[PDB]
Amino acid sequence: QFPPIAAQDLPFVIKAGYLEKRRKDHSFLGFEWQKRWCALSKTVFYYYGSDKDKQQKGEFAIDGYDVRMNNTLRKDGKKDCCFEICAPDKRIYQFTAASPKDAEEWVQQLKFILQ
Predict the structure, then answer these.
(1) Would the N or C end of the chain have less CB density within 10 A of its end CB?
(2) CATH number of the CATH domain containing 94
(3) Among 73, 64, 65, which residue's Cα sits nearest to residue 97?
(4) Are 71 and 82 in contact (CB under 8 A)?
């Protein structure tokens, strides 16, 4: 979780790439979907503006969370790229990747670690 680290300074990145991350709530001029540089650092999921920011917009431990494809999070044709990191008591994080294969790789990689 908390200490401000730089994207390029993160330890053991298991996977990283751009994703669109869904906004928390509803009044969002232009967009509910925002391009973020995301990285899995060990068991913490970090997300940034760009792959060279010196500070995360936020982060979260993946402890207790499950992860699945969810093709309801959009109405457009990009729905096939959508996945989420979710749990009954936790903040749900939702994303769209670049292609179904990429969403599946992210989910596959987050899962191989949820073991």
Answers:
(1) C
(2) 2.30.29.30
(3) 73
(4) yes
- Answer whether 19's CB lies under 8 Å from 63's CB: no
Q: Are 105 and 15 in contact (CB under 8 A)?
A: yes
Q: Give residue 115's identity as a one-letter amino acid code.
A: Q
Check the CA dihedral 114-21-97-94 and report its sign. Answer: positive
Judging by beta carbons within 10 Å of its beta carbon (0-12, 13-18, 19+), is residue 87 exposed, middle or buried? middle
Distance of CA 5 to the CA centre of its chain: 17
What is the distance of C-alpha 44 from the center of its chain?
11
Method of determination is X-ray
Resolution in A: 2.1
- DSSP symbol at 54: S
